[PDB]
Amino acid sequence: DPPPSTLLKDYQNVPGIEKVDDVVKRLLSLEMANKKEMLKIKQEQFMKKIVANPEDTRSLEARIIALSVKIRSYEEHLEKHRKDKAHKRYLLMSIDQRKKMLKNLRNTNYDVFEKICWGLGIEYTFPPLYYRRAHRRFVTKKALCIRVFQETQKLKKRRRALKAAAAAQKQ
Amino acid sequence: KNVLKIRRRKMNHHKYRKLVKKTRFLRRKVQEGRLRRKQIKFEKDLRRIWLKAGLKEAPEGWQTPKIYLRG
Amino acid sequence: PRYELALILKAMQRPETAATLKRTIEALMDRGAIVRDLENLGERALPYRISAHSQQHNRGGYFLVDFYAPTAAVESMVEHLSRDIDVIRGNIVKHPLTQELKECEGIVPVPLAEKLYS
RNA sequence: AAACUCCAGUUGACACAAAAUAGACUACGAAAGUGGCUUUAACAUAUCUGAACACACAAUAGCUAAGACCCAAACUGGGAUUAGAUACCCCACUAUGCUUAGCCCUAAACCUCAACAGUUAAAUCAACAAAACUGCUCGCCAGAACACUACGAGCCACAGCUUAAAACUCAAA
Ligand SMILES: [K+]
Ligand SMILES: [K+]
Ligand SMILES: [Mg+2]
Ligand SMILES: [Mg+2]
Ligand SMILES: [Mg+2]
Ligand SMILES: [Mg+2]
Ligand SMILES: [Mg+2]
Ligand SMILES: [Mg+2]
Ligand SMILES: [Mg+2]
Ligand SMILES: [Mg+2]
Ligand SMILES: [Mg+2]
Ligand SMILES: [Mg+2]
Ligand SMILES: [Mg+2]
Ligand SMILES: [Mg+2]
Ligand SMILES: [Mg+2]
Ligand SMILES: [Mg+2]
Ligand SMILES: [Mg+2]
Ligand SMILES: [Mg+2]
Ligand SMILES: [Mg+2]
Numbered sequence: 001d002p003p004p005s006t007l008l009k010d011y012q013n014v015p016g017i018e019k020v021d022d023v024v025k026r027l028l029s030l031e032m033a034n035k036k037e038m039l040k041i042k043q044e045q046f047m048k049k050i051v052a053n054p055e056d057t058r059s060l061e062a063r064i065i066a067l068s069v070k071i072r073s074y075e076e077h078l079e080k081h082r083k084d085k086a087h088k089r090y091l092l093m094s095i096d097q098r099k100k101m102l103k104n105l106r107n108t109n110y111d112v113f114e115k116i117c118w119g120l121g122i123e124y125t126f127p128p129l130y131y132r133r134a135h136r137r138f139v140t141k142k143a144l145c146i147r148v149f150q151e152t153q154k155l156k157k158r159r160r161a162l163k164a165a166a167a168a169q170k171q
Numbered sequence: 172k173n174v175l176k177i178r179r180r181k182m183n184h185h186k187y188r189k190l191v192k193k194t195r196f197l198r199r200k201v202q203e204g205r206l207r208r209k210q211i212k213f214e215k216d217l218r219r220i221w222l223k224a225g226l227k228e229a230p231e232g233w234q235t236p237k238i239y240l241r242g
Numbered sequence: 243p244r245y246e247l248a249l250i251l252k253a254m255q256r257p258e259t260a261a262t263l264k265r266t267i268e269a270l271m272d273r274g275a276i277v278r279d280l281e282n283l284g285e286r287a288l289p290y291r292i293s294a295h296s297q298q299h300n301r302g303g304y305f306l307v308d309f310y311a312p313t314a315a316v317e318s319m320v321e322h323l324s325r326d327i328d329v330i331r332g333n334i335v336k337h338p339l340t341q342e343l344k345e346c347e348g349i350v351p352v353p354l355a356e357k358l359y360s
Numbered sequence: 361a362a363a364c365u366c367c368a369g370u371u372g373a374c375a376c377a378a379a380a381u382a383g384a385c386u387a388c389g390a391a392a393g394u395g396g397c398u399u400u401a402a403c404a405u406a407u408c409u410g411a412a413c414a415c416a417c418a419a420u421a422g423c424u425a426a427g428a429c430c431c432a433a434a435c436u437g438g439g440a441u442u443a444g445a446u447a448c449c450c451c452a453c454u455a456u457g458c459u460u461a462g463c464c465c466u467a468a469a470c471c472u473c474a475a476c477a478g479u480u481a482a483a484u485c486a487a488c489a490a491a492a493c494u495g496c497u498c499g500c501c502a503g504a505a506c507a508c509u510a511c512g513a514g515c516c517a518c519a520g521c522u523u524a525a526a527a528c529u530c531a532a533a
Contacts, residue, residue, distance in 0.1 A: 004312075023276060031274070032310050034243060035401070058406065070404075077401055085417055086403070089390075092416060093404040100405080131414035135514060136238040141217060147230035148221045155225065177468085184508060188519080195519045202518070209513095241518065245399090293373080316399050333398060360386065 002041045004031035009040045035073070043069045050119035052112075060108070061116055064101045068120050070094055098122075206239045213238065244278075244310050244337040247319075250292075250330040251303040253285055259303055262328040267307065269322045275311035288330075295327045302330045308337060 011017060011028045030038050046065045047054045056062055074091035078084060102124055106113040117124055134142075191198065214235050221229055229235075247270075251262055267277055283304035292299045311319070316334050323332035 026276060027310055031312050032243065032276075034313060060406095063406070067405075073402085074404090081401075084402090086389075087401085089416060090402085090404050093390095095404090096415090097405045128414085131411075133413060133514070137213060137514085140213075140236060140238055141220075144217045144230070144233065144235075145220055147233055148224050148226065151221075151226055151230045152224050174468095179505085180508065183506095187509070191519050199518075206518095241516095298373090313400055320399075335398065357384090357386095 002030060002038060002045070004029060006030045006041055008033060008037055009044060039069050039073055042072075046119060050115055060101060060105045061112055064098060064105065064116055065120065067094055067098050067101070068122070071098065099127075210237060210239050243313065244308070244340050245316065245334050246337045247307040247309065248333045248335065249305040249307060249323075250288070250332070251305060252294075252297075252299065252328045252330055253301040253303060254328065258328070262326070263305065266323075266326070266329070270307065270309055270311065270315075270319060273311065273315040273318050273322075275309045275315055275319075278308040278310065279306075281306040281308075292330050294330045299330050 005025070007017065007025070007028050008030070017025075017028070026032060030041065043066055044054070046069070047062060050065060051059065051061045053059070057066070071091065071094045074087055074094060077087050078091060081087065102113065102116070102122065105116065106124065113124075116122065217235055218229070249266065251259060254262070263280065267280065270277055283306065285301060285303045288300055288302055292302075319334060320332075323329050326332075
């Protein structure tokens with residue numbers, strides 16, 4: 001998070017803000033503001049770090065960064081409010097909307113898609129091909145079918161050496 | 172509108188709930204037996220797999236769990 | 243943000259009332275608050291009897307403290323006021339002067355059809 | 361009638377219950393819901409559509425555990441009524457309604473109006489509801505009853521929920 005002494009986004013570029021009294025600096029800092037003001041500073045930090053034009057807020061990159069800041073705020077909210085179903089819905093919807101943005105950015109501008117992933121620390125994931133419950137019967141059977149495959153592979157390798165050994169003896 | 176269709180459904184559901192109430196001990200014995208057969212049918216399906224793959228016994232360390240018991 | 247503390251103090255003599263205000267403003271400062279003003283609204287009869295700290299009150303000293311503080315200071319200050327025996331009732335609200343009133347052109351008529359329709 | 365008679369009235373102290381008036385308002389939220397006060401956090405998406413099952417929710421009732429308990433209150437008990445009264449009427453009291461942590465996943469969950477976009481000119485239009493329609497997409501339906509059922513499968517559900525037939529029968533519904 002930005003330091004609490006950080007000035008608000010509105011008062012950072014006023015001339016003479018560095019020569020005012022310390023009390024005036026406290027009143028124009030993040031310490032004396034609500035959390036939404038800290039999120040505006042975070043968004044601007046990511047914009048300058050990632051996007052080519054930090055002032056283009058309608059680009060697909062800026063929307064991903066803006067929504068990524070909202071997503072992080074919901075996660076912090078839900079860390080303290082674990083039964084807040086309203087904000088849990090907002091988080092899951094926001095993650096889905098960003099994935100749609102990342103999908104559309106990956107298809108149109110891959111170089112920018114890579115910088116967004118590195119800058120925001122997003123590991124893009126491709127969606128599953130099928131949506132179907134993995135119930136107990138399927139989970140148990142799939143595990144058995146993998147064990148059976150693993151055992152068959154071992155037996156097939158012990159039928160390569162014995163055949164190899166016998167062939168050498170003939171010579 | 173009239174509620175004559177709801178009334179037909181109402182009586183059907185009342186009589187069903189009452190029927191289940193009267194026979195809840197027989198139905199519990201029947202349900203227990205079905206779950207046993209369901210478990211046996213499941214164990215056979217897994218045994219078919221390793222047997223059709225050439226193995227003679229279950230994979231080393233494999234125990235088929237009871238996936239239908241209340242526990 | 244900017245807050246307004248509406249403080250009702252136990253009716254006391256001037257020395258004990260000043261000691262309570264100083265002790266209350268220092269608690270705000272200890273929690274990071276920047277105190278802007280202190281207003282005396284006068285001692286008056288309470289609108290109803292208030293029981294606080296095993297005592298019944300019919301009169302109190304009404305004071306206001308305008309101050310800026312971090313959002314985390316409110317929760318801690320409310321707890322401090324609950325333990326001060328000389329405070330009858332203390333409430334911290336967002337300062338009303340921060341909220342800017344939006345301009346109003348007037349009372350637009352509402353169609354009666356919507357009333358019954360709605 | 362029963363019940364109470366450490367009862368009732370005034371005064372004072374006094375809650376983990378419930379939130380007159382405002383509200384003749386029609387707001388917030390995806391819906392369910394949300395109407396005492398304060399504060400903090402906070403109400404996704406710069407094209408739409410997109411799931412019985414994926415993901416996350418979902419009134420009331422109900423389950424498991426630990427608490428609170430004013431009042432209300434299934435059940436139960438008592439009083440009365442009645443041909444009978446397992447009711448309606450009166451009294452008492454419990455589960456329950458509350459909190460905490462888990463479940464359960466239903467509703468006449470209904471504006472009984474699917475989402476989005478567009479039109480008010482055509483014929484205005486079976487009827488009633490709520491003026492009549494177009495584009496586009498998903499979901500769903502194909503006589504009644506059997507059937508919010510049977511069997512299968514899934515599920516913390518085990519007297520449950522979801523999905524959901526057939527045979528016999530009728531000329532209606
Ligand atoms: K109220
Ligand atoms: K309705
Ligand atoms: Mg029937
Ligand atoms: Mg959609
Ligand atoms: Mg759906
Ligand atoms: Mg489907
Ligand atoms: Mg359903
Ligand atoms: Mg529910
Ligand atoms: Mg409950
Ligand atoms: Mg009572
Ligand atoms: Mg009786
Ligand atoms: Mg009780
Ligand atoms: Mg309460
Ligand atoms: Mg409703
Ligand atoms: Mg739809
Ligand atoms: Mg049919
Ligand atoms: Mg049902
Ligand atoms: Mg069923
Ligand atoms: Mg079944």
